[PDB]
Amino acid sequence: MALVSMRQLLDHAAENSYGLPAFNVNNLEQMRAIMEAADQVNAPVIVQASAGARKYAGAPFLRHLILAAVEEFPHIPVVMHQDHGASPDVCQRSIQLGFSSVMMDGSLLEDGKTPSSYEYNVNATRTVVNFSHACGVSVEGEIGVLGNLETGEAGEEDGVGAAGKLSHDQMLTSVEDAVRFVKDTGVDALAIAVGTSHGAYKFTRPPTGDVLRIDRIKEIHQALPNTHIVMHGSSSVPQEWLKVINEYGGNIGETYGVPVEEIVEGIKHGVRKVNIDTDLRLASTGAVRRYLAENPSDFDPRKYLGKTIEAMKQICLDRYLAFGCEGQAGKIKPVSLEKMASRYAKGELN
């Protein structure tokens, strides 16, 4: 079986009033956790990979992890999405490696750290949209710079994130910039900046409506009722796993993530893709620390790494269920990328 386009999945999510978690993958245990969770609740899958993931795993290994997933779970539609593409050339290479969706992150320059001009962003993103749609491949773009609205800090997602203190206007997407950007690029999915950031250290206190601007998601959805919105940096940071990490030799200070309740509110207002990485890292590290402490004579990696599969799988299950994904995989009839390309050429997805 083949991969599905992200545009098909996000269209179905909007039609049926749900939103999909998009999980980062780096190795076998992470891929098994994602697929086993999706299979259990019969949910569609978006799996994504960063440039850091390619460096760690190797491009052939990432490609073949997804091919194995589709073979073992043939009834589960799978998108393979390239996160934080630094340039059109990067996105073109990802298409050649078999990705069905790419993010051209034109909100930063090719260094993945310097905020870009509007014109640079549109030029790079429009370029990727044109050559991706010719192949049926979906494109996510970003307008606004991810970062914390109180501190001006973005954090780092596998080396990607603004360097230096950001201004309020940089980190909060204006409604009209979102409108102009969609008109100018034709992206399939729009990442916006509303106060989330990469990593575990998103908020020093439980986020308020002033620092996590769900109200701005509502405003953008009112202006762009048909645009699928992407929430980056939207791990919830499970306090129960922070507790386990701190109990078994780790040290993570008091910090909070994006609450599931607020993500669900975003889904009611057009969020169809919710990027989650840090939560799986925290669940994995808590599970390994606890197993090693409780089983000092066990040296089979499958024993403690098996605990990371189960811990990550429970995160994924929780998110699929809370975001409305149960049973939706059985409703989707996959469209080939060649057919998607034909639909783009006819203007049916404008």
Add this chain to the structure above:
Amino acid sequence: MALVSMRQLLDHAAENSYGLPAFNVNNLEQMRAIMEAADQVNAPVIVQASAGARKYAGAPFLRHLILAAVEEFPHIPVVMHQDHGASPDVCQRSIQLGFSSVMMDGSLLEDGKTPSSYEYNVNATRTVVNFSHACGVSVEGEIGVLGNLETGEAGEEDGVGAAGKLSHDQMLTSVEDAVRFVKDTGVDALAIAVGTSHGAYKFTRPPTGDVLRIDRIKEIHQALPNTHIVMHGSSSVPQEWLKVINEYGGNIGETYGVPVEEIVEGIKHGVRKVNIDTDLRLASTGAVRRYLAENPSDFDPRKYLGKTIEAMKQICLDRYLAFGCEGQAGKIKPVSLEKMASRYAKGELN
């Protein structure tokens, strides 16, 4: 590029007076460690998987890990070998999944625990040889029951290993039984029992010539000068990694493995395949325990799992170099399995 047969690699090892380590694989980090080591020293690769590995990783994932390895390292010939096949049906399924070599472990019944009769063993093994050679697939068989000659205990390799106390005669392959078994089966590789066993707890003291019968390998090689011998249970158990595990929250008592020096002596007398699993598990667990202790705030699995890649890679490098494998990959012109099947049919590999 395709997989190579194990018979081709073992023939080349005998022609050039070296022996190959055969590493068990269960996930991405293990596969990368093996391939990066082999690429660094330009050595051929035997990677093997147990039934326990299939249960843990999934058969499509194991298959695609090997496909990714061949794609990223196209100049490194790779065998994918099914370890401890419990029945002809299991070995047939492994061929269907794309293995280029299988072990029919007829020394135990299908439960993987009850020692078999000679006739059962020959019947199962001959059956697998006939249908494997018709496809060009290599076959390893075993005569003699693995286990410790002083204690009568075999240990467990992913659930495989004799149950109950074994007799001296069961655990030490006689020369004439090896001769009869090769004549009766036509295997490509012969596993024998000379005092090794699965796992870390092979010997309570550094092994002597009485408990690790390298002299019997010499005797069997004198009787069967053209038979490629397989040493199971031949991890060395690195004392430096035991020290690290014990320093960082683990507890492994005093125990010893098979010394590299004795394995090299075996290679001089016909050992061409040396099975190693436990050493990679020990290197992995020591590396993760140390990293977690030294970096309490780090929760990115790639950081501590990356240390397992490097630790396992160093084991593999050490073994490839010590066993004579450096540079040998560049000398091998791969033969397709279809051509191997033709050679078998013409009697050229009898």
